[PDB]
Amino acid sequence: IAGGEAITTGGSRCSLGFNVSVNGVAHALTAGHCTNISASWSIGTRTGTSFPNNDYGIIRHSNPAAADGRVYLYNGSYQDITTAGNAFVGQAVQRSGSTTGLRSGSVTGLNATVNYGSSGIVYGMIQTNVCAQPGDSGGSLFAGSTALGLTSGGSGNCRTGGTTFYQPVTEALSAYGATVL
């Protein structure tokens, strides 16, 4: 399973962010709002979660052979990931997620504060003009082979467009001592 693909727990669905390694052990990053739900996922067991404030979580794979170091493009192809980086305003990016598949746009703001009402406030989010819908959370924000973020939320949808926010992937990697595969 690769970045942007569906990960589930009972009746809930999110998207996998990036497959990563923690001291040689295969894990997957996803959104914190997702991992808060449960410890048991289709792909393994949750070993960390942080939401709100942040929006990241990590799941240890039950099957290490499944830790695919790519992002699925939803057209029968995949994008290889080799590093993690920081986003910059005006950067051309792509997002992969299980509801809407692959979409592109650009970064319009950094360090944005996002108020999700009853769900709380998240800080330091990447802001983009890429659309997303429920189910897309945790999915990959990338630019070529460089990993940038995990889908958190936004407004609108993919028919009318909207604004979306992403948790910077580097903060999630350093929180867990992980490296992208």
């Binding site: 709002h33 009402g117 959370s137 939320g153 936004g154």
Partner: peptide
């Protein structure tokens, strides 16, 4: 905005 809301969490996706």
């Amino acid at each position: 905005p809301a969490p996706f």
